[PDB]
Design a protein around this ligand. Structure first.
Ligand SMILES: COCCN1CCc2[nH]c(-c3ccnc(NC4CCOCC4)n3)cc2C1=O
Length: 348
């Protein structure tokens, strides 16, 4: 049993020579050597069993990744856990190892317009497959976009992913949210639970802006500050976009603000490709009903040298409904995680 940052990684003997590569609230990621396939891999230790919320998220992440197979999406190669429910303290997901992430890359490197175009194409190609499966990623950000030296990109971290539920998306003003602040769509703070595909498109728009300048476009200092940054650039929403906001607290908040004019994309990004800024504008649309969809984004003139719908696959088996796991206790969720991972066990 190897040890990384005071965390036991019970993955042997197949997986050895571990090294820290990432973290979350209830998990840790390591790189390791796979003695069977003779390659280095990424291993994610998930420790969710003490919290019901974490158990729901674990079962979703596993179920989703086991169904998905796409070049621009991190897959599951193996799942390690103890042979019995009693002995199962953690769950280890084995994934292909990637060299870096877009967050690490943007901290140090200027991207050429060809690199932005290629990385954006891959994000949208992977996102087309996810949305085609009736799934929402809900935490797209640069650290969840993995890269190698040949510029291949893979979307990772489906820990907050859900089946889309547009009929149950409505909520109140400033209602609590999980996903990362800077990549949060304005409707999250206003009237959305983030159960529609347009949530992911906003995050992609924030990522594109960030690839263009190496700086987050909307860097809210805290939860409440986020809408200030968005409206600071986009300007006051139109009468038509306000009439779509029917909860009075959110509407009246927006109506109380002094008029703010739109900051043109060409002033924020004076070196950017005019086609890239046109697509950015359509992704960073205030009204989610007017926001560009993934298949429209792929067909945008900015991506014309890559666009090929016959080479942009969709999911063979989309998820029909979400799982109703909210009332299920963490002990019952532990059982479903055990049953979902059974196929990877020796002597199965
Ligand atoms: C506790 O989990 C929370 C969510 N989450 C955190 C980030 C993350 N990274 C990887 C991963 C997979 C493959 N290859 C690499 N490679 C590294 C990229 C960065 O540079 C060093 C190598 N990372 C998976 C996850 C993940 O699911």
């Amino acid at each position: 049993p190897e040890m990384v940052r005071g965390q036991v990684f019970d993955v042997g003997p197949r997986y050895t020579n571990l090294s820290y590569i990432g973290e979350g609230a209830y998990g840790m990621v390591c790189s390791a050597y796979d003695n069977l396939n003779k390659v280095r891999v990424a291993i994610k230790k998930i420790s969710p069993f003490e919290h019901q919320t974490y158990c729901q998220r674990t079962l979703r992440e596993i179920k989703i990744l086991l169904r998905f197979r796409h070049e621009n999406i991190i897959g599951i190669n193996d799942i390690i856990r103890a042979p019995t429910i009693e002995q199962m303290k953690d769950v280890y997901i084995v994934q292909d190892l990637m060299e870096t992430d877009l967050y690490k890359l943007l901290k140090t490197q200027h991207l050429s317009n060809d690199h932005i175009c290629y990385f954006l194409y891959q994000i949208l190609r992977g996102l087309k497959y996810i949305h085609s499966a009736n799934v929402l990623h809900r935490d797209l950000k640069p650290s969840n976009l993995l890269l190698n030296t040949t510029c291949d990109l893979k979307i990772c971290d489906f820990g907050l992913a859900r089946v889309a539920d547009p009929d149950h998306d409505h909520t109140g003003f400033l209602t609590e949210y999980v996903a990362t602040r800077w990549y949060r769509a304005p409707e999250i703070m206003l009237n959305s639970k983030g159960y529609t595909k347009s949530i992911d498109i906003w995050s992609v728009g924030c990522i594109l802006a960030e690839m263009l300048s190496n700086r987050p476009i909307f860097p809210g200092k805290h939860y409440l500050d986020q809408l200030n940054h968005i409206l600071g650039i986009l300007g006051s929403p139109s009468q038509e976009d306000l009439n779509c906001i029917i909860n009075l607290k959110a509407r009246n908040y927006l109506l109380s603000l002094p008029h703010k004019n739109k900051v043109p994309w060409n002033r924020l990004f004076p070196n950017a490709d005019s086609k890239a800024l046109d697509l950015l504008d359509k992704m960073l649309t205030f009204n989610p009903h007017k926001r560009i969809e993934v298949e429209q984004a792929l067909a945008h003139p900015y991506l014309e040298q890559y666009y090929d719908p016959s080479d942009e696959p969709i999911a063979e088996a989309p998820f029909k409904f979400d799982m109703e796991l909210d009332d299920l206790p963490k002990e019952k969720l532990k059982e479903l995680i055990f049953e979902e991972t059974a196929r990877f066990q020796p002597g199965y």
